[PDB]
Design a protein around this ligand. Structure first.
Ligand SMILES: CCCCCCCCCCCCCCCCCC(=O)OC[C@H](COP(=O)([O-])OCC(O)COP(=O)([O-])OC[C@@H](COC(=O)CCCCCCCCCCCCCCCCC)OC(=O)CCCCCCCCCCCCCCCCC)OC(=O)CCCCCCCCCCCCCCCCC
Ligand SMILES: CCCCCCCCCCCCCCCCCC(=O)OC[C@H](COP(=O)(O)OCCN)OC(=O)CCCCCCCCCCCCCCCCC
Ligand SMILES: CCCCCCCCCCCCCCCCCC(=O)OC[C@H](COP(=O)(O)OCCN)OC(=O)CCCCCCCCCCCCCCCCC
Ligand SMILES: CCCCCCCCCCCCCCCCCC(=O)OC[C@H](COP(=O)(O)OCCN)OC(=O)CCCCCCCCCCCCCCCCC
Ligand SMILES: CCCCCCCCCCCCCCCCCC(=O)OC[C@H](COP(=O)(O)OCCN)OC(=O)CCCCCCCCCCCCCCCCC
Ligand SMILES: CCCCCCCCCCCCCCCCCC(=O)OC[C@H](COP(=O)(O)OCCN)OC(=O)CCCCCCCCCCCCCCCCC
Ligand SMILES: CCCCCCCCCCCCO[C@@H]1O[C@H](CO)[C@@H](O[C@H]2O[C@H](CO)[C@@H](O)[C@H](O)[C@H]2O)[C@H](O)[C@H]1O
Ligand SMILES: CCCCCCCCCCCCO[C@@H]1O[C@H](CO)[C@@H](O[C@H]2O[C@H](CO)[C@@H](O)[C@H](O)[C@H]2O)[C@H](O)[C@H]1O
Ligand SMILES: CCCCCCCCCCCCO[C@@H]1O[C@H](CO)[C@@H](O[C@H]2O[C@H](CO)[C@@H](O)[C@H](O)[C@H]2O)[C@H](O)[C@H]1O
Ligand SMILES: CCCCCCCCCCCCO[C@@H]1O[C@H](CO)[C@@H](O[C@H]2O[C@H](CO)[C@@H](O)[C@H](O)[C@H]2O)[C@H](O)[C@H]1O
Lengths: 97, 96, 98, 174, 115, 347, 82, 318, 171
């Protein structure tokens, strides 16, 4: 905040909703709760300039949880390789799949 | 009249909620084995489909952390009939 | 990203272009403003719902509330524009070039 | 085909946006916004937000009813323009559909698409959560928390709505 | 599915009734028959001419009031909170400000139609 | 407007600005802008004439558009970081959209077209709020997001604002349009130094507000809105012509007046970072601002323009306007250079 | 006296608004006077939407029960009698 | 088996609607010291069939000045949405069990207004336009009060599920603790259904036929079927809300009989009211809701938030 | 970034408790009391370990206790129980309040024949303590080492040397 009246007065106006790992109703956790907790605790107190490099691993995992871009790339590759073998007659899925 | 009836309805809700709490351990244990079984099967059939691929390593994580991560729908049902995928994704929302 | 985001982001962009490319009626542009907010509501709701950000579920509702305050404000000015000129045409609002 | 339900609704979402963004008579623009609001409710509902989806539809139906009334009063002409009646409106309308149709055609063909930024076209279900078994709706718990956690939000929104009434009275008192 | 099937069936039933209504009866179309109705004499001016709205201010107020109910409809769920002291205060606070805004518009003659 | 309603609306303009400055959550920042926009519009329409209606409409369309781009940035930021904290943004596309959104709110070039027109179409008291108080909220956001702002984008906006503000004011005879283009020119200095030292952005902002408040108060004191109407002031109140002269020379940045202080501290910060060409270009281009300030001093104080016979009637009546704080503001606008090291209070 | 003179007038002219304000006043006032209000929050607390995660017995938690039917822990006898 | 269930819902709806037209004409007739249809079939029992056949073999007209697509669309929307209103109704089991059934009904009621607005506008005739703009005023009059009336009742039920209202009223009808809301709800449904004394969007004696003046034959019939279907559906909704029928899970047909009797009588009350009163002026309708119901509805909403909390009788969420 | 370690299909094998939810619900209250210990040892494990792979053994003991619990009912109270859950299964919501008569018959049967007492209202929602011989995990999140904090600035605040030192200013 430009003026930190919330800290000066010790009143919580909006920071209860700033992060998804904050206290939720009935303790419902977000899907990326662990990832964001790890990132927040890694970067706590050292500043963004340091956190940008020293907490890169935690932030990258957190980003992967949020948007799942690497997982979708991986699944898109497997699904592509399956259609490659189905038409070429080189693989029969199992019954359970 | 509504006060008394709503009090009793609240005592009934607590009994119903507690029966669920009694069974959650068993349901949780079943869910863990089922999820792990589905992931294991996905891994078996990943190896065959992607054996020939040059740089592939089967079952590689996308995460730097080795911590257990809950799979998303595509990870778990990625290679299964649409009937089962459709039921697992939209079955609840589409149930009347 | 997931494919749904392609069409929601596209819808926002379409309405933004619709807002920035005026015709005559001022009412038509106010509609494009309302459409822009609708895409933002949907785009925000998807993110919050999919990530299970429980407390953020109220945020889209708050978005609609200030959307109505904007629409009501927009319509109020349209009434005055219409009263002055007898149309809601935006080419009539050119007195302030000089 | 049903696994692509959110995608199909989102295609109609854009088509409704192209509808009112090309800016025909506001009568038809309101129609396009109602369709988009309707399918938009369908999109959000399919992500588990039944209350959010129905609410945005309900609000926008009320809003477009007022817009309709104001249109017949303040935004009408002798020959209200449909999408085919005007060359600028038709060009924008066609351009929107063709841009939309080509994004759809290529994202489906490749299960992926680069339209400025990369979008994956595996189907929208793949990102969904896999383990739900609570005795409540998480969206309902989050929304209801507005009255226990969102004291500050309640105050600023409630105050803004009251000021809103005061302001529109001022603005329209010639 | 059940929901989409139900909507499709209803609106298809309505569409079929219209198709029958137009294709079954014998038609005889000429200019005078299809002319606009106005009690026997030809209309004076287009029906597309502007139609003044005398309740325009209530109509804008409806938009603001119609969003208030979106804020209030969650109240049955909010009543399940453990923090009932805050919830009851904010629920009453919101409704009172709605009443105050109504009383203001009423006292300022916003609810009277322009003559 | 009922006097009580005017006070409630004014306090809501301030509350929306305050909310932006104290919020740690992007949603509450957006709410603050929306609340501020809602309250200011009736102040623009206060006199109810076609020009006020046109001004308010143009203002509403611009600010409402900026808010949608502002909220788009917030939601994109949420997708790529999963949080709402007001700080650096985590996506370059979000940074651009937010930066443009704040540029339109400030009226920086090339999003500047509304500022001259809106300022001309509303009274002087409303124009004072628009060109002063309304800068606080967008600047307070830039002050917090600058570590992620694109340097080329922000310096491009600053360069264009200084050029367009300087050129735009050369062709104006209307005082409200002169102040509007001056405001655009001064906005550029504030953002030009923001990437290097945000403390100098605040200093320029504060000094700009004091000088701009002083000028508007003096225009209100005499109910003058055009160059020629202001040229009669020497015949009514000679003292006010000297205050205008001192204030205008200050806004031109001439030593030893206060308005030189921000130009001086901004050039220092830019040179420390090996930025030599840009401050030189900025200082020379600010001579355009000095030019059309100097014209006003000529027609107002340093010559005596023709008067009218009816002007004699005004000699017999005193100034009744409140002129709140004008004695303090004019002294601050002019005699503050010896206290420059006090800028560390803003650190 | 003016208390009744004003009230009688509004009863005659706008009984709808008289009833509205009386009902709204009771809503604001009675919750602070009712002795049953305290149970509203207790009942909401006693409703178990979540699993009660057990604690690692570390050898000194006398107030915590080992079995759900142990005498320790909160009881709902007050709720059966409500 | 679901498709069969759909047909066993909408075929009976349309048959009940057809014979509601006969019942109205007989009930009005006897209240008017006459008989009403008693020649076409015994006791006029074939009269609805004659009218239906008549209209659908009548020539349908597309006015020269009308907007063709919107002209056709509006009646299709009217009947389609009218039938959609019935799917979440628990009689005692809904066809579609919805978590937010009440909210669904509200949204669909709002959408059905556009079948009035678009038909009137698409007709491109002055009486049709005047009728449609009366529908705008009518919606503005009742919609806000209608939603808040429901909210106050649902604070006792605890959910937006229609089937929960059956559970809520197992000991006692909600009409007892909320008869002031029942009063205001009942009037709001007359306005919502465009029924006398709020028959303004048609306003025969003023607007000839208002929004549907240019409609003939089958397209006109669709509007008639829609309105009469909504009249029945809104009184079923009123019966569920305020006169909850007890449900025995093993004898579900006893619920249906008791609930059907209640819904019929409430529908007869609509006809009775039509026979009794003059018509409102449409600005006087707006002042009725905003200056009388809304202040009272807001006060009662405050009361019904506080009352469960102060009496420790908040209903279960589930 | 690593291979995800999954148990083999052999390790995931256990004799399932294959009864319907109506059966589970009808026996829930007694099952909550009779199988509390393995159940609460499994739930402590899952919440501490945060890994389904790390609690498989505890999961099996939950299953084994369930089967043992249901075998006791089958031996001694099959008919009274079959009536009870048959009544529960009829209800679309599976409500307890529609089968108090059959519940009483089942309850008294298990009480007489096995000494099983039904838990009271509020018993099964209690937070209980459980003794375990499994060691508390050390780094359940697999956290890396936290970056070191910025070196703290400490000392006695002295006046600025020669003042501001801004250009010519001497103070
Ligand atoms: C179930 C659907 C019920 C509606 C059925 C509509 C078709 C009825 C047949 C008909 O139109 O009459 C014959 C009519 C021709 O009669 P005509 O008197 O010779 O000419 C009529 C006018 O030229 C043209 O007629 P017009 O003046 O009414 O304007 C044409 C059209 C404008 O048409 C266009 O310019 C582009 C196509 C519009 C439809 C696309 C949707 C618009 C954008 C919103 C996105 C929604 C996506 C869905 O106007 C519209 O706005 C169409 C609205 C359709 C809403 C559909 C609901 C969604 O149409 C033809 O068959 C040709
Ligand atoms: C301190 C360290 C920092 C250094 C920064 C610089 C500090 C100076 C800041 C100045 C602040 C503004 C206040 C200046 C006070 C001027 C007093 C004055 O001008 O006399 C008043 C008189 C007004 O007339 P009146 O009140 O009616 O008296 C009877 C005559 N009719 O006036 C008149 O009648 C004059 C009318 C004719 C106009 C002549 C204009 C030329 C003289 C202008 C001199 C002031 C220039 C100030 C600019 C800065 C100078 C460095
Ligand atoms: C540090 C800078 C301090 C700047 C103080 C500004 C004081 C300006 C006083 C103006 C002179 C008094 C006056 O005439 O009132 C003008 C105006 C009220 O409007 P008025 O036309 O007078 O009458 C309203 C009836 N319809 O008065 C107003 O509406 C007040 C508008 C000015 C408020 C914004 C001031 C600039 C931002 C200050 C933030 C500083 C950090
Ligand atoms: C302003 C006077 C000059 C007028 C011509 C304008 C010149 C250009 C103005 C631009 C700024 C340049 C100022 C240059 C001096 C600033 C640097 C400086 O002076 O050092 C810091 C100064 C303390 O001075 P120091 O060296 O410590 O000597 C102490 C003597 N007791 O601490 C300071 O910074 C404050 C000193 C500012 C200089 C003016 C104040 C001197 C005190 C006299 C005030 C008047 C008191 C009498 C009041 C009369 C009331 C009618
Ligand atoms: C301008 C011309 C307009 C012409 C009108 C055309 C007809 C449109 C009719 C209205 C369209 C909007 C329909 C919105 C349905 C919302 C109803 C609902 O919320 O319940 C349906 C169900 C959710 O069930 P729920 O209880 O909330 O949670 C699951 C618990 N098992 O969820 C489902 O059953 C699945 C539904 C998913 C598909 C929704 C598609 C809607 C898209 C609009 C068509
Ligand atoms: C004064 C004129 C006013 C005109 C306005 C119109 C008002 C008409 C209202 C019509 C509806 C009135 C009620 C109709 C009674 C129908 C009786 C019936 O068929 O059911 C029997 C019923 C008891 O059964 P039940 O409702 O299940 O018990 C409630 C527990 N939940 O009944 C018990 O005896
Ligand atoms: C006024 C304009 C109106 C239109 C508004 C449209 C808004 C659309 C928002 C889409 C946001 C996408 O944002 C963009 O995503 C891609 C992901 O591949 C990122 O891509 C980049 O960063 C990520 C990791 O940081 C990696 O993919 C890689 O380093 C690089 O490709 C971009 O850094 C980011 O800018
Ligand atoms: C008013 C105009 C409205 C325009 C609406 C436009 C809707 C957009 C069209 C989306 C069409 C989606 O099309 C969908 O693509 C996927 C491609 O995997 C198909 O899914 C496919 O998956 C597997 C792949 O192993 C195939 O074996 C299977 O045969 C096929 O179904 C779906 O069968 C198809 O329904
Ligand atoms: C224009 C602005 C208008 C603002 C109007 C604000 C009106 C607010 C009136 C007070 C509303 C709440 O009133 C207050 O509610 C709480 C609980 O709900 C009551 O609290 C009571 O019940 C709660 C639990 O339910 C217990 O924790 C508490 O010990 C008990 O006293 C208070 O006794 C009562 O004083
Ligand atoms: C907490 C919610 C419940 C509390 C009630 C909240 C709503 C309060 C409504 C406004 C109350 C005061 O504001 C209102 O002022 C106008 C003055 O023009 C009065 O209105 C006056 O003219 C109108 C039209 O002829 C009529 O209502 C009436 O004949 C007369 O009293 C109202 O009688 C009074 O009610």
């Amino acid at each position: 905040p430009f003026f930190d009246v919330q800290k000066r007065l010790g009143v919580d106006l909006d920071r209860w909703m700033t992060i998804q790992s904050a206290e939720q109703p009935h303790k419902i956790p977000s899907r990326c709760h662990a990832f964001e907790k790890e990132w927040i605790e890694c970067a706590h107190g050292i500043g963004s300039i340091r956190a940008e490099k020293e907490c890169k691993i935690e932030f990258e995992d957190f980003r992967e949880c949020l948007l799942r871009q690497k997982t979708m790339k991986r699944l898109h590759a497997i699904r592509r390789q399956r259609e490659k073998l189905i038409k070429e007659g080189k693989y029969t899925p199992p019954p359970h799949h | 009249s509504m006060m008394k009836w709503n009090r009793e309805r609240r005592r009934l809700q607590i009994e119903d909620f507690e029966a669920r709490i009694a069974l959650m351990p068993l349901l949780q244990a079943e869910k863990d084995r089922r999820v792990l079984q589905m992931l294991r099967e996905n891994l078996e059939e990943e190896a065959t489909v992607m054996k020939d691929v040059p740089g592939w390593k089967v079952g590689e994580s996308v995460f730097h952390t080795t911590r257990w991560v809950t799979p998303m729908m595509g990870e778990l049902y990625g290679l299964r009939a649409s009937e089962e995928v459709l039921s697992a994704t939209y079955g609840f929302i589409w149930y009347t | 990203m997931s494919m749904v985001y392609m069409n929601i982001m596209m819808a926002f962009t379409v309405s933004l272009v619709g807002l920035l490319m005026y015709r005559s009626h001022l009412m038509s542009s106010l509609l494009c403003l309302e459409g822009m907010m609708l895409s933002l509501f949907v785009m925000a709701a998807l993110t919050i719902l999919n990530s299970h950000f429980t407390l953020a579920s109220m945020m889209p509702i708050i978005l609609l509330v200030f959307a109505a305050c904007e629409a009501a404000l927009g319509l109020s000015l349209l009434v005055m524009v219409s009263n002055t000129y007898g149309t809601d045409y935006v080419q009539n609002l050119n007195l302030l070039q000089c | 085909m049903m696994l692509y339900i959110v995608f199909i609704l989102s295609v109609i979402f854009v088509m409704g946006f192209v509808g009112f963004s090309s800016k025909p008579s506001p009568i038809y623009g309101g129609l396009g916004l109602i369709v988009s609001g309707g399918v938009g409710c369908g999109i959000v509902l399919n992500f588990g937000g039944s209350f959010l989806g129905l609410m945005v539809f309900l609000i926008y139906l009320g809003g477009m009813m007022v817009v309709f009334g104001y249109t017949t009063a303040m935004a009408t002409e002798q020959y209200p323009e449909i999408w085919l009646s005007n060359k600028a409106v038709l060009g924008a309308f066609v351009t929107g559909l063709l841009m939309e149709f080509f994004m759809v055609y290529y994202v489906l063909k490749d299960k992926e698409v680069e339209v400025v930024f990369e979008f994956n076209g595996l189907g929208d279900w793949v990102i969904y959560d896999t383990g739900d078994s609570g005795f409540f709706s998480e969206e309902a718990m989050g929304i209801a928390a507005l009255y226990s956690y969102g004291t500050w939000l309640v105050i600023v929104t409630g105050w803004s709505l009251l000021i809103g009434v005061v302001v529109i009275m001022e603005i329209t008192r010639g | 599915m059940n929901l989409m099937l139900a909507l499709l069936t209803n609106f298809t039933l309505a569409t079929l009734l219209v198709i029958i209504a137009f294709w079954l009866p014998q038609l005889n179309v000429y200019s005078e028959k299809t002319s606009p109705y106005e009690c026997g004499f030809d209309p004076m001016g287009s029906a597309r001419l502007p139609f003044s709205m005398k309740f325009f201010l209530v109509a804008i107020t409806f938009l603001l009031f119609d969003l208030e109910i979106a804020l209030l409809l969650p109240l049955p769920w909010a009543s399940q909170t453990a923090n009932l002291n805050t919830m009851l205060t904010m629920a009453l606070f919101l409704i009172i400000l709605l009443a105050v805004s109504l009383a203001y518009e009423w006292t300022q003659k916003g609810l009277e139609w322009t003559e | 407007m009922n006097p009580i309603i005017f006070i409630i609306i004014l306090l809501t303009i301030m509350l929306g600005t305050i909310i932006v400055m104290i919020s740690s959550h992007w949603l509450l920042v957006w709410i603050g802008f929306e609340m501020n926009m809602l309250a200011i519009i009736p102040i623009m329409m206060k006199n109810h004439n076609p020009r006020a209606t046109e001004a308010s409409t143009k203002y509403f369309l611009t600010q409402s558009t900026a808010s949608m781009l502002l909220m788009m940035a917030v939601i994109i930021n949420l997708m790529f970081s999963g949080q709402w904290t007001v700080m650096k943004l985590f996506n370059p596309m979000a940074s651009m959209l937010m930066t443009m959104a704040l540029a339109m709110k400030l009226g920086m070039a090339p999003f500047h077209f509304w500022v001259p027109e809106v300022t001309q179409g509303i009274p002087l008291s409303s124009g004072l709020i628009l060109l002063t108080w309304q800068k606080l909220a967008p600047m307070s956001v830039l002050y917090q997001i600058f570590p992620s702002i694109n340097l080329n984008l922000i310096l491009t906006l600053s360069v264009l604002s200084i050029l367009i503000g300087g050129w735009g004011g050369l062709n104006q005879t209307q005082l409200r349009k002169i102040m509007a283009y001056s405001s655009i020119a001064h906005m550029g200095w504030m953002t030009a130094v923001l990437p290097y030292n945000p403390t100098m952005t605040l200093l320029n902002l504060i000094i700009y507000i004091i000088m701009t408040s002083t000028m508007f108060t003096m225009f209100m004191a005499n109910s003058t809105t055009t160059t020629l109407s202001l040229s009669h002031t020497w015949n009514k109140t000679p003292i006010m012509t000297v205050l205008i002269l001192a204030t205008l020379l200050s806004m031109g940045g001439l030593p030893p007046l206060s308005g030189f202080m921000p130009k001086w501290m901004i050039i220092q910060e830019m040179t420390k970072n090996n930025s030599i060409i840009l401050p030189t270009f900025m200082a020379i281009t600010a001579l355009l601002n000095l030019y059309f300030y100097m014209r006003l001093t000529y027609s107002t104080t340093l010559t005596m323009f023709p008067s009218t016979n009816n002007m004699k009637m005004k000699w017999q009546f005193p100034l009744m306007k409140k002129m709140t704080f004008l004695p303090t503001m004019v002294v601050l606008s002019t005699m503050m250079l010896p206290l420059t090291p006090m800028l560390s209070v803003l650190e | 006296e003016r208390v009744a003179a004003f009230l009688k007038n509004v009863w005659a002219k706008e009984p709808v608004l008289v009833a509205s304000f009386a009902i709204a006043g009771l809503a604001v006032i009675l919750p602070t006077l009712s002795p049953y209000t305290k149970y509203s929050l207790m009942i909401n607390r006693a409703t178990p939407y979540n699993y009660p995660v057990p604690l690692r017995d570390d050898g000194n938690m006398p107030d915590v029960p080992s079995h759900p039917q142990d005498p320790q822990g909160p009881s709902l006898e007050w709720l059966k009698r409500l | 088996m679901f498709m069969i269930n759909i047909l066993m819902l909408i075929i009976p709806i349309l048959l009940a609607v057809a014979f509601l037209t006969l019942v109205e004409r007989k009930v009005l007739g006897y209240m008017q010291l006459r008989k009403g249809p008693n020649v076409v079939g015994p006791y006029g029992l074939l009269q609805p069939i004659a009218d239906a056949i008549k209209l659908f073999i009548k020539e349908p007209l597309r006015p020269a000045t009308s907007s063709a697509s919107m002209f056709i669309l509006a009646p299709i929307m009217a009947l389609g949405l009218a039938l959609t209103m019935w799917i979440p109704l628990p009689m005692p089991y809904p066809l579609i069990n919805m978590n937010l059934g009440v909210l669904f009904m509200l949204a669909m009621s709002s959408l059905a207004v556009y079948s009035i607005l678009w038909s009137g506008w698409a007709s491109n005739s002055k009486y049709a336009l005047i009728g449609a703009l009366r529908a705008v005023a009518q919606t503005i009059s009742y919609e806000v009060t209608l939603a808040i009336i429901l909210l106050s009742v649902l604070l006792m039920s605890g959910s937006f599920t229609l089937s929960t209202l059956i559970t809520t009223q197992e000991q006692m009808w909600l009409i007892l603790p909320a008869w002031p809301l029942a009063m205001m709800w009942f009037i709001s449904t007359l306005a919502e259904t465009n029924r006398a004394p709020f028959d303004l969007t048609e306003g025969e004696s003023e607007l000839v036929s208002g929004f549907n003046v240019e409609y003939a034959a089958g397209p006109f019939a669709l509007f008639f079927m829609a309105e009469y279907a909504n009249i029945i559906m809104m009184n079923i909704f009123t019966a569920i809300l305020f006169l909850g029928t007890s449900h025995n899970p093993h004898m579900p047909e006893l619920y249906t009989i008791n609930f059907t009797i209640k819904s019929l009588l409430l529908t007869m009350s609509f006809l009775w009211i039509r026979a009794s009163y003059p018509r409102f002026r449409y600005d006087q309708l707006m002042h009725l809701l905003w200056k009388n119901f809304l202040p009272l509805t807001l006060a009662l909403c405050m009361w019904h938030v506080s009352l469960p909390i102060l009496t420790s009788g908040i209903p279960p969420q589930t | 970034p690593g291979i995800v370690e999954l148990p083999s299909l052999e390790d995931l094998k256990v004799q399932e408790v294959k009864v319907s939810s109506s059966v589970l619900k009808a026996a829930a209250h007694h099952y909550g009391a009779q199988c509390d210990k393995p159940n609460k040892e499994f739930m402590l494990c899952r919440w501490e370990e945060k890994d389904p792979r790390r609690c498989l053994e505890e999961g099996k003991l939950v299953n084994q206790c369930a089967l043992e619990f249901f075998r006791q009912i089958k031996r001694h109270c099959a008919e009274p129980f079959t009536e009870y859950w048959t009544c529960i299964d009829y209800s679309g919501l599976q409500l307890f309040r529609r089968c108090r008569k059959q519940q009483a018959q089942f309850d008294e049967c298990v009480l007489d024949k096995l000494g099983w007492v039904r838990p009271d209202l509020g018993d099964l929602s209690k937070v209980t303590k459980v003794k375990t011989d499994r060691p508390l995990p050390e780094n359940p999140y697999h956290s890396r080492a936290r970056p070191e904090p910025n070196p703290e600035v400490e000392g006695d605040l002295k006046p600025a040397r020669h003042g501001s030192r801004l250009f010519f200013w001497t103070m």
